[PDB]
Amino acid sequence: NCPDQNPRLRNWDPGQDSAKQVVIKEGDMLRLTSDATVHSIVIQDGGLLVFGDNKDGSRNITLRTHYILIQDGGALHIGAEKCRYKSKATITLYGKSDEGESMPTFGKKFIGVEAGGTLELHGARKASWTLLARTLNSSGLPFGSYTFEKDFSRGLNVRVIDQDTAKILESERFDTHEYRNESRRLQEFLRFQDPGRIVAIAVGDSAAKSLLQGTIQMIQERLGSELIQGLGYRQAWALVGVIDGGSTSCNESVRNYENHSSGGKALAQREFYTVDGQKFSVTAYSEWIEGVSLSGFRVEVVDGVKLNLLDDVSSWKPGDQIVVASTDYSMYQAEEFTLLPCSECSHFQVKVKETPQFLHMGEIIDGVDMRAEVGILTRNIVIQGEVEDSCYAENQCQFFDYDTFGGHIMIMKNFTSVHLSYVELKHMGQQQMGRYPVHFHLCGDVDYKGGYRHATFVDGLSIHHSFSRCITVHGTNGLLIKDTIGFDTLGHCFFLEDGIEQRNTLFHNLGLLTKPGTLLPTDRNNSMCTTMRDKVFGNYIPVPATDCMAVSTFWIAHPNNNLINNAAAGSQDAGIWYLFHKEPTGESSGLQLLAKPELTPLGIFYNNRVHSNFKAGLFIDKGVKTTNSSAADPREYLCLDNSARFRPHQDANPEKPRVAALIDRLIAFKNNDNGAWVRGGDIIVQNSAFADNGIGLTFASDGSFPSDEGSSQEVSESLFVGESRNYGFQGGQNKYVGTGGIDQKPRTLPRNRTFPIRGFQIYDGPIHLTRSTFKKYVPTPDRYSSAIGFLMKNSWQITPRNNISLVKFGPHVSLNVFFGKPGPWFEDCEMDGDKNSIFHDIDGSVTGYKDAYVGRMDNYLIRHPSCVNVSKWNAVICSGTYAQVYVQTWSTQNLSMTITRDEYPSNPMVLRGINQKAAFPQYQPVVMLEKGYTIHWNGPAPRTTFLYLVNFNKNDWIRVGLCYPSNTSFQVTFGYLQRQNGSLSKIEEYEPVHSLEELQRKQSERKFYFDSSTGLLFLYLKAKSHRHGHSYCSSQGCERVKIQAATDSKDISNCMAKAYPQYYRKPSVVKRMPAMLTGLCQGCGTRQVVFTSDPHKSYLPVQFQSPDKAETQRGDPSVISVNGTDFTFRSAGVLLLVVDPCSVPFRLTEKTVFPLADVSRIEEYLKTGIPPRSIVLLSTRGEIKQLNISHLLVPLGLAKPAHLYDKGSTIFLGFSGNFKPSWTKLFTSPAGQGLGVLEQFIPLQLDEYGCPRATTVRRRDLELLKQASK
């Protein structure tokens, strides 16, 4: 099975001749056995070059070549998919851009597969990437590294160290030189110390002058010091001991004072273990150097740092490198680590050499899986480009101060077999077009539709520190990419080029640190986009937001592609970008689309993660300018064009039915702008969680009529979070930090500190927000945070069909909805869209009114006297029927429309139009059905106007009164406007009447009344045909009315001086009010309690509530919540829950509560009463003195009998069994302070627990993997 175990292989050894060219032709079945340096290698005519492997994995081979050119049946094998390569091989691609000559199709520094070429590489199978099963605070410690040093801190400097957490509890300086009162506060300091607290001391300047014998006795007693009895003048001394630890828990030293020097330091150092197995050393010192008396401490991690992971990583080896991602807004918080030899590590742990500088989440935070991804980079098959210490030549050096010209791999069409697996690709790619670390160029169908038995696959590579892209797909369908890692590369990491690439499946792939590039406009950052005008027209200055700044980790230029189990852990702009090309571009720019892209239904999208990005997590909009730079459109070719309207239909056929695009199990957090932006017709986002984003989710469509007739936009079974317990880390270019909304803690923020954080944004529509839950949305005095809101600075449409249903709000959600105010982010808040903000509360889950509509407070076109003023939301709650009217005006530009309802004439609405850049500006206010309005202008009357009835049911109607000069003839026509072909069908004319009263009798007749006194052209707008679903227009078209005026009066057509109070009617109520219902519905919210990226493993949400003294007086109980079960208890004592770890849903086998009296009986029950393999949940309440259980916690998980002590409450989660999980934890506190509200997540049905495998765990992801294969 092995390719090197081929007997026909000759052993090869060419030498070190950088000018020796090599050609492997027919019969040349060579087996490389030693390091080599040749100019080139060309494998052709059936030649074979296999790397020689060993049964043990020791033969380190390093090839070095200007290039390798595989073609015409030639083969290059480094192991086989069945008999994999075991030693460490390396192919170094060298040669500068301007050194020697270059190839025609290829550049230099490459490995190039051609037609019929065989490139077969298969490295050592390792584990690609998993998640942190435990968090990792900076500097390796739970509460961080302490370093201190100061000159002339005279006296006895003291520090206390929590023996379980290595936290600095107290820091004090007792001037036992001058003041005898100080040697007295020092002795009383050591009397009230908890036993077992690590203590360190260091003489500052000169102690031993006012020091008392009662204190020197206390030091010898509490800490086991043998030398304190004889401290002297200007004598340095440092100690590190354990309170009540006897003499053997102590380590001390001393130095004399001679010739103004101590001849060296006086160091005291011991090692301890956190209760988490992490080792740390407490260090203290005091010395004299030529006169200075320094004194310092250092509490730091020692013997490497032990990391916790989700899955088994036994395949990782010392001397290999890994990477831990950012769990904060700045992607530059990802870090590199080198694996230490660890004999004491389990299957879910390794040891890293370095000290972490940042914070990396390893827990599920408030139901959102914020665990940091962790991936291995070192392989045994390496293909690397040779680079320089700094930039050179015209390799884009004004932007990069380093070499950006490495190697690249390139595979042409009609090849034989490409199968790359477990290969390391360092310093690959060039800043030249087509030169990418793995470049599949125009290969066509490469699966069962192209003729490949083994579909061409890329399995678990490692492409890091590359100079352009990571893997590029150039006009290739059906490719597979699996378990691959792309780190610190330029331009879009994973790249779908021309927008024709379909059937490609991306499974469980990871991408970090996607930095700006210089290739495409979309790849450039703000500085590069304003510089490279070499491809723009004339003196045009490119705009860096509308044409560039589109750096994405996953660039999907076509939707028919399957994205599963991936994770975009950081990017300069976006994490996953789905976009659409109007017609094929690039080198594929030519063949006609037989299925235009923005009509093709989305492939699979299931269980993805996106975080650490500045512009978006998942983005679905925009296109590429499919035209070169010209005089009518000077934008660069392939820049960003916001004129793409997704609208998926069957077979990409707009005459055929709609096909919804499913966004499933998206997890997205710590994004600076949007968590997800999705536009078009028929999109359903479900089972998704959004957290710590500036805006959680936004649904778009079009600004006038929807991009696809009948466009529903659903979000169901989702979860939103505002400011979770992921306080982030103020570092790694984290540009924003502020005050939390709830706890008012220092945390990192997405944008400026006054940005109103938002959960869901309403825009365009029609949008169905259902069965979703919002948590932790509190505003600060700076910003107006809210759960549900609207898009800022909106001027377009908003429909009253946007309904929010079955939504649940958390206890820390103070502002359910908000409509904006004049401020820094809303500006006027006075544009055409801001004024017409509205949604529909179907069931009464948002406002407490079954079937009620909500809009902005000062919008008087929707108000009847039964409404409820709401000032906090800046809104108003009412009920009725509502639609919209679109008013197009010609002949007059920059015109501002003023429309008023008769019933509230003192409250008109001045609109400013929609096309203040085009020639046909329309105005789109929202109205209440079966009412009368009037319209007036800030200028002369338009000679032609169209009235569209949008969202009208049959027989729904309003009366309208247009202001015209007293001197006008009219000609009014109705018709059905067919959206498809611009034709007007079934046209009817209007006939005048004598009075407003005669037209009222003829309400369903095509009649109009003109009041020459006021100038009002009255008529009735009534719909004849029916609607269907959510389409804005009727069955037989978009009903519209056309009014052709004939006048020469240039006067401001504003009749309100004359129209009222002549046509005033007393305000009435068509649809009356219900009553409130503060008390949530049964069913409100999302069914799922926790959203993880391993949906197959069931996670048990557990939540505690241990009040304090002011709350125990006020009566608040102590509660242990399990999946939503409040096991309440208020007696002073202990509540112990025994949960079966194999039951899903959980089966709690025993609940027990121990009073303060029978506290002594918990010793016994813990020793025996706990069934084997049983999850222990335990929380106390009140002053519990002497809990002789400090030692009884270790078999359940702990490392050493930690010290709760005193009378403080405690909370513990453990396991009675052989295994010792990573989630086991403990929370101690002083009495009366309590523990507040914490939240843990316990996985269930793990084979570590000792549970049987009832059935095979239904991995829904892998089912989508085998379905999309064939």
Ligand SMILES: *[C@@H]1O[C@H](CO[C@@H]2O[C@@H](C)[C@@H](O)[C@@H](O)[C@@H]2O)[C@@H](O[C@@H]2O[C@H](CO)[C@@H](O[C@@H]3O[C@H](CO[C@H]4O[C@H](CO)[C@@H](O)[C@H](O)[C@@H]4O)[C@@H](O)[C@H](O)[C@@H]3O)[C@H](O)[C@H]2NC(C)=O)[C@H](O)[C@H]1NC(C)=O
């Ligand atoms: C329908 O009725 C309106 C209203 O006319 C009313 O009744 C008469 C009796 C007068 O009292 C008016 O003041 C009332 O408002 C008519 O509008 C006015 O029409 C008259 C006659 O056409 C206009 O008087 C002229 O105005 C000229 C100014 O406009 C000219 O100059 C500009 C300058 O650029 C030029 O661009 C434009 O094309 C015009 O040619 C003025 O030069 C001239 O000497 C004469 O006085 C009066 O100005 C009109 N009002 C306004 C606001 O313009 C309508 O004309 C009438 N319909 C039709 C079809 O005629």
Ligand SMILES: *[C@@H]1O[C@H](CO)[C@@H](O[C@@H]2O[C@H](CO)[C@@H](O[C@@H]3O[C@H](CO)[C@@H](O)[C@H](O[C@H]4O[C@H](CO)[C@@H](O)[C@H](O)[C@@H]4O)[C@@H]3O)[C@H](O)[C@H]2NC(C)=O)[C@H](O)[C@H]1NC(C)=O
């Ligand atoms: C804007 O300018 C860019 C250049 O900066 C320009 O891109 C060029 O487009 C042409 C499109 O024809 C590309 O030419 C192709 O070259 C490949 C091989 O290199 C050929 O195989 C292609 O022909 C195939 O397609 C035909 C149609 O089916 C078949 O009949 C034929 O037999 C072949 O199968 C094609 O000739 C050219 O490579 C690019 N160049 C670059 C640098 O991208 C772009 O077209 C300009 N914009 C517009 C709108 O034209």
Ligand SMILES: *[C@@H]1O[C@H](CO)[C@@H](O[C@@H]2O[C@H](CO)[C@@H](O[C@@H]3O[C@H](CO[C@H]4O[C@H](CO)[C@@H](O)[C@H](O)[C@@H]4O)[C@@H](O)[C@H](O)[C@@H]3O)[C@H](O)[C@H]2NC(C)=O)[C@H](O)[C@H]1NC(C)=O
């Ligand atoms: C633009 O596209 C629109 C949508 O395709 C066109 O809309 C029109 O919509 C009406 C609906 O009110 C269609 O009415 C159809 O009526 C036929 C009945 O005719 C049948 O019988 C006669 C024999 O008497 C036969 O000659 C016909 O071919 C039919 O077989 C029904 O079968 C339909 O279900 C439907 O009710 C119109 O047909 C339809 N127009 C067309 C051209 O189909 C709009 O007309 C288009 N405008 C332009 C300018 O092309």
Ligand SMILES: *[C@@H]1O[C@H](CO)[C@@H](O[C@@H]2O[C@H](CO)[C@@H](O[C@@H]3O[C@H](CO[C@H]4O[C@H](CO)[C@@H](O)[C@H](O)[C@@H]4O)[C@@H](O)[C@H](O)[C@@H]3O)[C@H](O)[C@H]2NC(C)=O)[C@H](O)[C@H]1NC(C)=O
């Ligand atoms: C914690 O509490 C949660 C409360 O929501 C639990 O989550 C849900 O628990 C219910 C328990 O009834 C599960 O319902 C199961 O559904 C599966 C699958 O059938 C589904 O599909 C069919 C149609 O094919 C439909 O008719 C069913 O109603 C289901 O919707 C069945 O095999 C079971 O018999 C049972 O009906 C939910 O599926 C589950 N929600 C999920 C998994 O998202 C949770 O289990 C509790 N325990 C934990 C988290 O450990």
Ligand SMILES: *[C@@H]1O[C@H](CO)[C@@H](O[C@@H]2O[C@H](CO)[C@@H](O[C@@H]3O[C@H](CO)[C@@H](O)[C@H](O)[C@@H]3O)[C@H](O)[C@H]2NC(C)=O)[C@H](O)[C@H]1NC(C)=O
């Ligand atoms: C490790 O993670 C923890 C948890 O987020 C971080 O702990 C926080 O550290 C800050 C230090 O600036 C504490 O602020 C101060 O705490 C003292 C002691 O109670 C208090 O008297 C001050 O008023 C101030 O609040 C903060 O309390 C603490 N978190 C909590 C919940 O108390 C820590 O910063 C992370 N990193 C390291 C290196 O420890």
Ligand SMILES: *[C@@H]1O[C@H](CO)[C@@H](O[C@@H]2O[C@H](CO)[C@@H](O)[C@H](O)[C@H]2NC(C)=O)[C@H](O)[C@H]1NC(C)=O
């Ligand atoms: C790749 O090679 C195949 C095989 O030669 C080409 O497929 C065609 O296969 C049919 C089978 O009946 C032959 O009759 C044709 O002569 C083959 N060639 C052509 C041009 O049709 C295929 O065209 C090749 N593709 C490329 C891009 O070279």
Ligand SMILES: *[C@@H]1O[C@H](CO)[C@@H](O[C@@H]2O[C@H](CO)[C@@H](O)[C@H](O)[C@H]2NC(C)=O)[C@H](O)[C@H]1NC(C)=O
């Ligand atoms: C938003 O509300 C509209 C109107 O209330 C809903 O449209 C109704 O849908 C039902 C189907 O369940 C139809 O039977 C009714 O005829 C529709 N019109 C009504 C009640 O006036 C719509 O389903 C809601 N959701 C969306 C996304 O539009």
Ligand SMILES: *[C@@H]1O[C@H](CO)[C@@H](O)[C@H](O)[C@H]1NC(C)=O
């Ligand atoms: C309700 O709010 C509007 C908005 O300004 C205000 O004009 C009106 O007086 C208020 N009425 C009541 C009864 O609060």
Ligand SMILES: *[C@@H]1O[C@H](CO)[C@@H](O)[C@H](O)[C@H]1NC(C)=O
């Ligand atoms: C429990 O521990 C305390 C230590 O504070 C000790 O005094 C007491 O005697 C212990 N309990 C029993 C029953 O000995």
Ligand SMILES: [Cl-]
């Ligand atoms: Cl209970």
Ligand code: NI
């Ligand atoms: Ni290519």
